[PDB]
Amino acid sequence: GSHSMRYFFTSVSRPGRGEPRFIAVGYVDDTQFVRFDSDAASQRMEPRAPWIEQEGPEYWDGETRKVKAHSQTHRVDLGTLRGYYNQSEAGSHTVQRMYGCDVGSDWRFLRGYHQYAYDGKDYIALKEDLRSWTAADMAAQTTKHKWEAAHVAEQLRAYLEGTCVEWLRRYLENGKETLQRTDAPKTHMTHHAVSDHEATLRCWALSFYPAEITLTWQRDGEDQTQDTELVETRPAGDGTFQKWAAVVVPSGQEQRYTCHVQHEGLPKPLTLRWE
Amino acid sequence: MIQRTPKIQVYSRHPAENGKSNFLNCYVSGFHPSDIEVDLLKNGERIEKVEHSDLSFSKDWSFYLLYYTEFTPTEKDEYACRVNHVTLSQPKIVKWDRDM
Amino acid sequence: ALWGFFPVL
């Protein structure tokens, strides 16, 4: 199965309320493994997954050193964009940054990411070629030129292709039981009468990992996409996820409906029918 | 500036069985900015020991957090999630329905 | 593990 490693960074300015709030989290697939928070007491990169707690002082000291560095960088960046956009010092602004690498089933490099957003709008993004930058506007173009001049893409390329992938495979192995597990969803349906002529049919997918899943309803094999109530995949809170899809069935028509579940840890897709 | 509204999902970790310990979750996502007040309520009262996941976001930069607390469902206890954001004139209250 | 170079916008 393909895997990925991503680092998400969020910085918010607190005008007259101290220095910007920085929150850094790291993920391997759908599993968070580390964290840093500017408002934290420790001021250290902390583990958020058992398997990463096995890393030594060297690792924790280096990540702490590097993450605080990112923190500062984002403190500068808030001021910088504020300048680029001729914005008031009173306004609270958000800078988010994301970077990571994906590896195929072969655990080989597939793609690297390095994007930024300012107040929710894409600012700049490394293009797939790992050689060019999508500068959103004039401001983002200023940053692009700086980066083309400083040859940032080349240093990133080496990271995204080398280091990033190297650490991913390491995490993958070191946290095997967790990261290299596929929990098939525990499915089941509920039937609740909504009226004297209709009923709700809900199909459940629970305790599954990874989060990738397809949960659909069909009437006579015909898809009911337009008529299905499908919720966003929720985290169970224990490392597995949940999701449901519901349809309103006219009484006596339950048999026409089939729910279908597709998931990596499922030997063969499921087709559930109320009967 | 961009102001996205948070989607709210109040559910439990395991299927609700009265008398059995569980976790009441409130998943808020798709919002922007990151500021958001989320509370879990038991019969109308805000629960004190409620934790939340570390602030992260999706590919569209929209944030997401999981607020959770340990609870033991009961036949007659009612739980809800109350959320507030710049995009909400008033705190949105989603009741917990064990069937959702 | 994090990137060791730290760029600024």
Side-chain angles (χ1 to χ4, degrees):
Chain A
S2 305
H3 300 278
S4 71
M5 175 170 85
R6 273 93 165 69
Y7 285 93
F8 310 86
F9 307 104
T10 307
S11 312
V12 193
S13 52
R14 298 182 286 204
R17 286 152 274 151
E19 276 291 87
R21 169 77 172 254
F22 177 70
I23 297 174
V25 299
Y27 279 81
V28 171
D29 287 337
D30 300 310
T31 309
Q32 192 198 342
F33 65 107
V34 293
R35 77 150 166 209
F36 170 83
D37 183 5
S38 59
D39 289 12
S42 63
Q43 289 299 288
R44 289 193 58 77
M45 179 75 105
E46 298 169 54
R48 295 297 286 188
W51 55 273
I52 195 69
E53 303 188 315
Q54 313 290 13
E55 286 289 343
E58 224 288 283
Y59 179 90
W60 292 116
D61 285 7
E63 298 301 294
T64 294
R65 201 220 84 229
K66 289 185 287 172
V67 74
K68 283 174 172 176
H70 289 225
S71 195
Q72 211 282 304
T73 281
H74 289 55
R75 275 177 168 146
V76 167
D77 291 350
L78 287 164
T80 306
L81 302 192
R82 168 201 153 293
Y84 287 164
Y85 298 97
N86 310 121
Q87 297 176 325
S88 38
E89 305 181 276
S92 170
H93 290 94
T94 313
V95 176
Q96 298 153 266
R97 169 198 192 172
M98 179 285 274
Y99 70 71
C101 50
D102 302 357
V103 295
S105 221
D106 58 353
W107 281 23
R108 295 191 204 131
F109 181 78
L110 198 38
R111 45 202 155 230
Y113 304 72
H114 181 83
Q115 287 92 67
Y116 282 78
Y118 188 46
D119 294 316
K121 294 142 187 174
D122 284 292
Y123 184 77
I124 194 167
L126 182 59
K127 269 159 155 57
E128 185 177 50
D129 69 346
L130 302 188
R131 310 256 288 173
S132 42
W133 304 99
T134 303
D137 53 336
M138 295 288 138
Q141 280 187 263
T142 294
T143 296
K144 190 165 91 239
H145 309 342
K146 278 184 176 184
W147 285 11
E148 297 176 324
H151 290 270
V152 169
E154 288 102 347
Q155 316 179 41
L156 258 169
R157 176 164 200 127
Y159 174 72
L160 303 175
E161 286 181 21
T163 308
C164 189
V165 160
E166 291 171 17
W167 279 101
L168 178 54
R169 297 162 146 174
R170 179 197 167 113
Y171 294 164
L172 288 176
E173 187 61 35
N174 292 351
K176 177 162 191 173
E177 186 187 321
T178 305
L179 304 177
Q180 289 182 254
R181 82 180 194 293
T182 41
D183 297 319
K186 316 298 176 292
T187 57
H188 85 270
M189 298 166 49
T190 66
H191 190 278
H192 167 248
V194 301
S195 64
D196 39 66
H197 59 297
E198 283 184 317
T200 304
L201 222 43
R202 206 183 312 284
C203 190
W204 288 90
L206 306 164
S207 255
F208 63 86
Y209 189 89
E212 183 57 36
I213 190 172
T214 302
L215 198 50
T216 311
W217 272 110
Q218 281 176 334
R219 183 179 59 184
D220 296 341
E222 325 148 9
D223 281 272
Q224 296 281 275
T225 14
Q226 312 273 310
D227 307 80
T228 301
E229 238 247 278
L230 188 64
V231 301
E232 194 200 328
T233 302
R234 319 109 65 110
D238 65 342
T240 66
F241 307 83
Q242 304 169 350
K243 185 206 250 305
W244 58 251
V247 292
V248 288
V249 174
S251 296
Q253 278 190 223
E254 290 75 14
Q255 36 274 93
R256 298 184 56 177
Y257 298 75
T258 50
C259 168
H260 306 249
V261 193
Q262 298 174 263
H263 182 84
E264 181 176 50
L266 233 48
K268 205 160 191 180
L270 301 161
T271 300
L272 322 186
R273 168 183 318 274
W274 184 271
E275 51 200 11
Chain B
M1 290 170 252
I2 281 175
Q3 303 208 153
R4 308 169 187 136
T5 311
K7 305 172 182 58
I8 303 161
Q9 275 187 102
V10 45
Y11 49 111
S12 64
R13 177 171 305 183
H14 308 287
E17 301 156 85
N18 303 342
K20 299 170 170 46
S21 63
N22 204 342
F23 276 80
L24 181 63
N25 294 318
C26 181
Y27 183 59
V28 294
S29 59
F31 61 94
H32 214 289
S34 45
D35 305 67
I36 194 170
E37 162 256 281
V38 172
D39 270 325
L40 288 189
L41 318 170
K42 177 181 186 175
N43 295 310
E45 142 150 26
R46 182 193 83 84
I47 301 176
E48 271 69 49
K49 195 290 292 173
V50 180
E51 295 206 296
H52 57 78
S53 51
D54 300 314
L55 182 69
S56 183
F57 49 93
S58 315
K59 273 196 178 298
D60 56 358
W61 314 101
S62 303
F63 295 106
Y64 68 80
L65 291 147
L66 177 67
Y67 283 76
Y68 52 96
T69 192
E70 306 188 8
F71 83 127
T72 300
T74 280
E75 185 199 317
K76 294 174 182 187
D77 279 323
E78 300 166 335
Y79 291 81
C81 186
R82 179 180 53 211
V83 180
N84 220 127
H85 191 246
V86 281
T87 58
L88 293 167
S89 44
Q90 284 169 32
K92 190 190 294 182
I93 302 188
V94 179
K95 297 171 181 185
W96 174 58
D97 171 17
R98 53 185 82 210
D99 311 282
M100 295 173 93
Chain C
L2 288 171
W3 189 24
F5 176 62
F6 320 110
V8 294
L9 302 184

